[PDB]
Design a protein around this nucleic acid. Structure first.
Lengths: 121, 44, 53, 111
RNA sequence: AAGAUGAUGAGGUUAAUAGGUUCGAGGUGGAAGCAUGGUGACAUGUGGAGCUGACGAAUACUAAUCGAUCGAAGACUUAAU
RNA sequence: GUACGCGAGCUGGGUUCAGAACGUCGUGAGACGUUCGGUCCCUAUCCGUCGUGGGCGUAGGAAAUUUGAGAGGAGCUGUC
RNA sequence: GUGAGUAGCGAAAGACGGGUGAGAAUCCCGUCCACCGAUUGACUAAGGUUUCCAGAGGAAGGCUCGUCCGCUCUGGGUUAG
RNA sequence: GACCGAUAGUGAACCAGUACCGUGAGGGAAAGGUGAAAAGCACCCCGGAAGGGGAGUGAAAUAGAACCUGAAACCGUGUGC
RNA sequence: GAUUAAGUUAUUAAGGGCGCACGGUGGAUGCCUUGGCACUAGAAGCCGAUGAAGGACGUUACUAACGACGAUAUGCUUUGGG
């Protein structure tokens, strides 16, 4: 219980795992305000497992990320666990906290939702 | 619930059709009032 | 439960004194030179100017 | 000397329009374009597209400058409805009145 | 620390109000990997270990940017000075 | 006492609906003491009440601290 | 017209990247995720009578939106000793 | 014709016993008017388009196919007390 | 215009009320007739096995509906008016 979202305590656990593993890939996503005042509390507890680089932590981070596959390493595969411990966990090895930021776009049309852009700093 | 119109092509013609009007005599008085009033469709 | 009377045109217009919308709270985006809603980014060319976004 | 541009029978309601037309009345025309582009309601781009016709029929064909213009009056009258029904429970049916509206913006230049 | 919304209250770079972070207190009760014992189930040791949402501290790394709107000039008459 | 207070707050056991049976009365259809079963509807406009905010007034405009006109609350008692 | 901008919006898991467009939480393509699986799957009777399909449409219908469509305009579609 | 003049006179002045309701016999409404003549708005401009504003035809478009005159209810914007 | 007290009467308008002006929706009234109703005078009062009354399907250069027409089909022949 950090903050509920209208999801039924079972969907909210598997919704943040759909925003985290699509933020280490695209490096920025466009979403609503309250879906991105909580995913800054997940992906900053997950680059911390990137700065360790253990065997326990390569397993203990895999239970909050999906298994997707990335193609353009000039035609070389890169699983989203391997994009961390890698080009993500080496960009921030001397910044102690504060990996994300939230940029408010505007209210979206026809729903009135305060859209924001989260992006890795 | 099961409603009161279960449609059928055969019972609709074997009962209300043209040749069941002209069968009896009082069918020819029904057909004498629907081409008198000026209906388009005489027999269903 | 139903109304007992027809509510008049004096009592109707009084009840929507407080039924309105408020002004947006705009600013002047100082690089492009437009209006934008404050603490938000510009929809045109425009920086955030504490962040240059 | 003053212009106008009347849009009529727009699909939106007549009471939800005149909350937005209440907001810009008697204001400078340079601001009022950019107030309707920050409010998040449903009749803001509709009113905006007819305010930018009283600001192009005041520069063309009257030849007055669009730096001094002021909204003198802006009022929403009522157009004809479209009575459609809604099948409601126990064999009843209620009438739903989709209303339409007339929008008129009149700009001025203080003369 | 307040709350249906508005209100009240703690803050806005002269900054510790939230998030992260490094330290704890509380909670669970011995993580994985390897090393040893055994035919295997499992057991011991490295180690009061590891993981830890709301409570206590610490440090500006991230977001509280740039700005806007409202708001005084102090009436008269009569006894005191 | 307050519609033997209170069913647009709840109950429906009861009393008083259609079914059925006994005792009894009726030549008859049926009837007056018991018996088993038996749909309880509504989105609060105005006064009333409980909360909580805007406007203007208190002869200049503001930040705090307070006198209490009046009105509420409390009021029971055992044993050794 | 008042009731009132009130009661509703007809069981139910969505998230994002890309295009498209005057306009996108809703349309199309991609990956991940969830739900039925003696059925929410696959063929034929009854009944309906062009709905099926490709190219263009956005006034009405769709309980919102719409570039979309079982809705509108054009042109096609059903083969037996 | 000391009969009616679009809620009248036929149910029907509009392509009426027709949309539509019913298994069936059977029930059954709604609709009229540009101008003397279509001379029915060439061309520019805001718009994705609708819808506008000028210029033009006309005796008049403040008669533009929501098309003669245009009452009240009801919704608006302005101002003296 | 206060230096102190004492006593008075104002201005405000988030919005509402009355009057006037100007707009929209709405289709009453006025003025018209293609259609009716009520009745006089002359006709007239039957068609059908040589296939009737009523109909479905068809017919134009392009035909959705009514009109008139039937594979000789949006008409053909002939005698008269024009």
């Amino acid at each position: 219980g950090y903050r509920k979202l209208g999801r039924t305590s079972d969907q909210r656990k598997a919704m943040l795992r759909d925003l985290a593993t699509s933020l280490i890939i695209s490096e920025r996503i466009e979403t609503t305000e309250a879906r991105a005042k909580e995913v800054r509390s997940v992906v900053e507890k997950l680059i911390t497992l990137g700065k360790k680089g253990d065997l326990a932590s390569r397993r203990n981070a895999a239970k909050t990320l999906r298994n997707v596959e990335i193609l353009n390493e000039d035609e070389t595969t890169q699983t989203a666990l391997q994009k961390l411990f890698g080009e993500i966990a080496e960009r921030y090895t001397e910044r102690q906290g504060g990996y994300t930021r939230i940029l408010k776009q505007g209210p979206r049309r026809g729903d009135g939702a305060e859209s924001v852009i989260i992006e890795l700093v | 619930v099961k409603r009161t119109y279960q449609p059928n092509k055969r019972k609709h013609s074997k009962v209300h059709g043209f040749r069941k009007r002209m069968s009896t005599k009082n069918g020819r008085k029904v057909l004498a009032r629907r081409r008198r009033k000026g209906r388009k469709v005489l027999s269903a | 439960a139903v109304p007992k009377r027809r509510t008049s045109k004096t009592r109707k217009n009084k009840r929507r004194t407080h039924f309105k919308i408020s002004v947006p709270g705009m600013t002047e985006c100082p690089n492009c030179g437009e209006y934008k809603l404050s603490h938000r980014v510009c929809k045109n060319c425009g920086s955030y100017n504490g962040e240059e976004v | 000397m003053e212009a106008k541009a009347v849009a009529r029978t727009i699909r939106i309601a007549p009471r939800k329009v005149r909350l937005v037309l209440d907001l810009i009345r008697g204001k400078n025309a340079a601001e009022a374009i950019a107030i309707l582009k920050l409010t998040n309601k449903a009749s803001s781009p509709v009113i905006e597209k007819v305010l930018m016709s009283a600001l192009a029929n005041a520069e063309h064909n009257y030849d007055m400058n669009t730096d001094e213009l002021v909204v003198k009056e802006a009022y929403a009258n009522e157009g004809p409805t479209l009575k459609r029904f809604r099948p409601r429970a126990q064999g009843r049916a209620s009438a739903i009145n989709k209303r339409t509206s007339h929008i008129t913006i009149v700009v001025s230049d203080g003369k």
